[PDB]
Scaffold this active site. Structure first.
Site, PDB file in Angstrom:
ATOM      1  N   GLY A  24      35.736  -1.027  14.384  1.00 56.40           N
ATOM      2  CA  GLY A  24      35.438  -0.146  13.166  1.00 56.40           C
ATOM      3  C   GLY A  24      35.022  -0.987  11.936  1.00 56.40           C
ATOM      4  N   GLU A  25      34.030  -0.651  11.713  1.00 55.09           N
ATOM      5  CA  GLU A  25      33.193  -1.744  10.293  1.00 55.09           C
ATOM      6  C   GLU A  25      32.506  -1.210   9.403  1.00 55.09           C
ATOM      7  OE1 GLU A  25      29.370  -3.199  12.004  1.00 55.09           O
ATOM      8  OE2 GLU A  25      30.562  -4.942  12.695  1.00 55.09           O
ATOM      9  N   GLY A  26      32.752  -2.083   7.341  1.00 53.05           N
ATOM     10  CA  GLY A  26      32.314  -1.704   6.999  1.00 53.05           C
ATOM     11  C   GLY A  26      31.466  -3.130   6.250  1.00 53.05           C
ATOM     12  N   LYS A  30      35.925  -5.523   8.545  1.00 52.58           N
ATOM     13  CA  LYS A  30      36.539  -5.005  10.436  1.00 52.58           C
ATOM     14  C   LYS A  30      37.378  -4.677  11.063  1.00 52.58           C
ATOM     15  CE  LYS A  30      31.947  -8.213  11.885  1.00 52.58           C
ATOM     16  NZ  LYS A  30      32.225  -9.455  11.050  1.00 52.58           N
ATOM     17  N   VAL A  31      37.565  -3.851  11.240  1.00 54.64           N
ATOM     18  CA  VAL A  31      39.184  -3.145  12.527  1.00 54.64           C
ATOM     19  C   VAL A  31      39.109  -4.073  13.585  1.00 54.64           C
ATOM     20  CG1 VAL A  31      40.953  -1.763  12.294  1.00 54.64           C
ATOM     21  CG2 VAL A  31      39.081  -1.357  10.415  1.00 54.64           C
ATOM     22  N   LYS A  51      42.972  -4.926  10.008  1.00 59.22           N
ATOM     23  CA  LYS A  51      41.725  -5.331   9.106  1.00 59.22           C
ATOM     24  C   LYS A  51      41.335  -6.961   8.903  1.00 59.22           C
ATOM     25  CE  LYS A  51      39.443  -3.260   4.488  1.00 59.22           C
ATOM     26  NZ  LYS A  51      37.929  -2.574   4.648  1.00 59.22           N
ATOM     27  N   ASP A 154      41.380   9.502  -3.167  1.00 60.85           N
ATOM     28  CA  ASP A 154      40.420  10.111  -2.408  1.00 60.85           C
ATOM     29  C   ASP A 154      42.008  10.602  -0.862  1.00 60.85           C
ATOM     30  OD1 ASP A 154      38.272  10.255  -0.902  1.00 60.85           O
ATOM     31  OD2 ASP A 154      38.198   8.185  -1.224  1.00 60.85           O
ATOM     32  N   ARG A 158      39.964  12.606   6.304  1.00 58.40           N
ATOM     33  CA  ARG A 158      38.942  11.380   6.994  1.00 58.40           C
ATOM     34  C   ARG A 158      39.540   9.937   6.486  1.00 58.40           C
ATOM     35  NH1 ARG A 158      36.511  12.834   2.366  1.00 58.40           N
ATOM     36  NH2 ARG A 158      36.442  11.638   0.383  1.00 58.40           N
ATOM     37  N   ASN A 159      40.445   9.963   5.707  1.00 57.08           N
ATOM     38  CA  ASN A 159      41.947   9.075   5.172  1.00 57.08           C
ATOM     39  C   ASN A 159      43.140   9.587   5.567  1.00 57.08           C
ATOM     40  OD1 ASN A 159      40.212   7.880   3.975  1.00 57.08           O
ATOM     41  ND2 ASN A 159      39.659   9.023   2.194  1.00 57.08           N
ATOM     42  N   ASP A 172      43.801   4.801   5.658  1.00 60.14           N
ATOM     43  CA  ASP A 172      42.784   4.321   6.199  1.00 60.14           C
ATOM     44  C   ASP A 172      42.382   2.454   5.841  1.00 60.14           C
ATOM     45  OD1 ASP A 172      41.365   4.471   2.923  1.00 60.14           O
ATOM     46  OD2 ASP A 172      42.650   5.321   2.444  1.00 60.14           O
TER      47      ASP A 172
HETATM   48  C1  LIG Z   1      45.428   1.437   7.423  1.00 60.47           C
HETATM   49  O1  LIG Z   1      45.893   2.326   6.312  1.00 60.47           O
HETATM   50  C2  LIG Z   1      46.980   1.400   5.662  1.00 60.47           C
HETATM   51  C3  LIG Z   1      47.037   2.119   3.745  1.00 60.47           C
HETATM   52  C4  LIG Z   1      48.426   2.356   3.533  1.00 60.47           C
HETATM   53  C5  LIG Z   1      48.875   3.204   2.537  1.00 60.47           C
HETATM   54  C6  LIG Z   1      47.312   3.547   1.817  1.00 60.47           C
HETATM   55  O2  LIG Z   1      48.293   4.308   0.431  1.00 60.47           O
HETATM   56  C7  LIG Z   1      48.147   4.640   0.766  1.00 60.47           C
HETATM   57  F1  LIG Z   1      47.277   6.488   0.959  1.00 60.47           F
HETATM   58  F2  LIG Z   1      48.103   5.538  -0.940  1.00 60.47           F
HETATM   59  F3  LIG Z   1      49.576   5.839   1.340  1.00 60.47           F
HETATM   60  C8  LIG Z   1      46.409   3.029   1.709  1.00 60.47           C
HETATM   61  C9  LIG Z   1      45.313   3.466   0.338  1.00 60.47           C
HETATM   62  N1  LIG Z   1      43.972   2.928   1.201  1.00 60.47           N
HETATM   63  C10 LIG Z   1      43.483   2.160   0.836  1.00 60.47           C
HETATM   64  O3  LIG Z   1      43.970   1.448  -0.315  1.00 60.47           O
HETATM   65  N2  LIG Z   1      41.916   1.696   1.261  1.00 60.47           N
HETATM   66  C11 LIG Z   1      41.358   1.425   0.493  1.00 60.47           C
HETATM   67  C12 LIG Z   1      41.185  -0.048   1.186  1.00 60.47           C
HETATM   68  C13 LIG Z   1      42.157  -1.559   2.168  1.00 60.47           C
HETATM   69  C14 LIG Z   1      42.730  -0.313   2.815  1.00 60.47           C
HETATM   70  C15 LIG Z   1      43.381  -1.019   3.877  1.00 60.47           C
HETATM   71  C16 LIG Z   1      43.314  -2.737   3.399  1.00 60.47           C
HETATM   72  C17 LIG Z   1      42.983  -2.969   2.747  1.00 60.47           C
HETATM   73  C18 LIG Z   1      41.974  -2.842   1.892  1.00 60.47           C
HETATM   74  N3  LIG Z   1      39.810  -1.280   0.433  1.00 60.47           N
HETATM   75  C19 LIG Z   1      38.850   0.065  -0.374  1.00 60.47           C
HETATM   76  C20 LIG Z   1      38.052   0.033  -0.857  1.00 60.47           C
HETATM   77  C21 LIG Z   1      37.490  -1.197  -1.468  1.00 60.47           C
HETATM   78  N4  LIG Z   1      38.102   1.359  -1.258  1.00 60.47           N
HETATM   79  C22 LIG Z   1      38.211   1.847  -1.110  1.00 60.47           C
HETATM   80  C23 LIG Z   1      39.482   2.376  -0.445  1.00 60.47           C
HETATM   81  N5  LIG Z   1      39.673   1.342  -0.181  1.00 60.47           N
HETATM   82  C24 LIG Z   1      46.085   2.628   2.753  1.00 60.47           C
END
Ligand SMILES: COCc1ccc(OC(F)(F)F)c(CNC(=O)Nc2c(-c3ccccc3)nc3c(C)nccn23)c1
Length: 299
Positions: A24-26, A30-31, A51, A154, A158-159, A172
């Protein structure tokens, strides 16, 4: 996603990560699917999702480090596993467990009323037992986040990600605003709000709390039982805001029993303090998920 919500960070050598292809891509990254060597003791070679940070500016590099610390702290059975970072030379990488089925929304939609079966899932629509198991696992992750006093903001299907054996975990890659832009209302030049998942006090007053997350979990439960349909799909963003602020509740999905709809309703009390705790929501769902077929067949 992590900062403003609420070294220890493990490091992986770049040579131990071998990129295979993009998943995936943003806007910010990218992942990739990758092979990771020497990561876990039992697995000599395992698949991971990597990521890659797009721009390694001072701000981004500091944001990366804060994200890494928080992801290292947030580790639990129903949260996506973060293995560590690779910061020796660009691009900076974050290494996660690979979740074969992708995001829970995509998984729900491909196993809907119209539904093929396979290794982990029977043919046809997901059954009540399976929908309850999905809901229960998402609830279990929220219980853990609530316990750390982490406010997600959020929470939506989707998350969440779905792995082998239908293990469902919250997580996510920060690309949901790019992949699912229709699930957000753009207010600013950049700001995008998941209004359909948000309670009245988040929309009206911009307050986000553990109680606003339970509201959002209520809406997650609705998504699960509609096989990933958008809440308020029939309404525009402004129409949805009006509905939510005027106290209209989402209707009971055809596949949702009255007992489960009651759990959604307990999440959607106007007053945050009158909403049921995520612990209690998890207890009711876990009980239903684990109930014998004889009980579930008459629900
Ligand atoms: C694959 O899942 C890993 C994961 C595990 C736990 C987690 O916390 C929770 F859900 F509370 F348990 C989260 C939360 N998600 C999150 O921080 N997303 C995120 C990221 C981001 C995501 C991954 C790596 C770096 C940045 N960047 C943004 C932006 C720029 N905007 C909105 C959300 N973003 C993710």
């Amino acid at each position: 996603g992590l900062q403003g919500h609420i070294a220890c960070v493990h490091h992986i050598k770049r040579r131990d990560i071998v990129l295979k292809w993009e998943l995936g891509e943003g806007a910010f990254g990218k992942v990739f699917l990758a092979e990771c060597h020497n990561l876990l003791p039992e697995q000599d070679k395992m698949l991971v999702a990597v990521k890659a940070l797009k721009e390694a500016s001072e701000s981004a590099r500091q944001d990366f480090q804060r994200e890494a610390e928080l992801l290292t702290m947030l580790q639990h059975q129903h949260i996506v596993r973060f293995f560590g970072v690779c910061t020796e030379g660009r691009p900076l990488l974050m290494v996660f467990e690979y979740m074969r089925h992708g995001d829970l929304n995509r998984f729900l939609r491909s196993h809907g009323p119209d539904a093929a079966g396979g290794e982990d899932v029977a043919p046809g629509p997901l059954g009540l037992g399976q929908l309850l198991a999905v809901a229960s696992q998402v609830a279990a992750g929220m219980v853990y986040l609530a316990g750390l006093h982490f406010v997600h903001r959020d929470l939506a299907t989707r998350n969440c990600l779905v792995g082998q054996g239908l293990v469902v975990k919250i997580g996510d890659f920060g690309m949901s605003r790019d992949i699912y832009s229709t699930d957000y209302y753009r207010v600013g030049g950049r700001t995008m709000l998941p209004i359909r998942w948000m309670p009245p006090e988040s929309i009206l007053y911009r307050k986000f709390t553990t109680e606003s997350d339970v509201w959002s979990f209520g809406v997650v439960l609705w998504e699960i039982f509609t096989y990933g349909k958008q809440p308020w799909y029939q309404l525009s963003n402004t129409e949805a805001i009006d509905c939510i602020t005027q106290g209209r509740e989402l209707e009971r999905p055809r596949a949702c029993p009255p007992e489960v709809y009651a759990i959604m309703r307990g999440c959607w009390q106007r007053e945050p303090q009158q909403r049921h705790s995520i612990k209690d929501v998890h207890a009711r769902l876990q009980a239903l998920a684990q109930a014998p077929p004889v009980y579930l067949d008459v629900l």
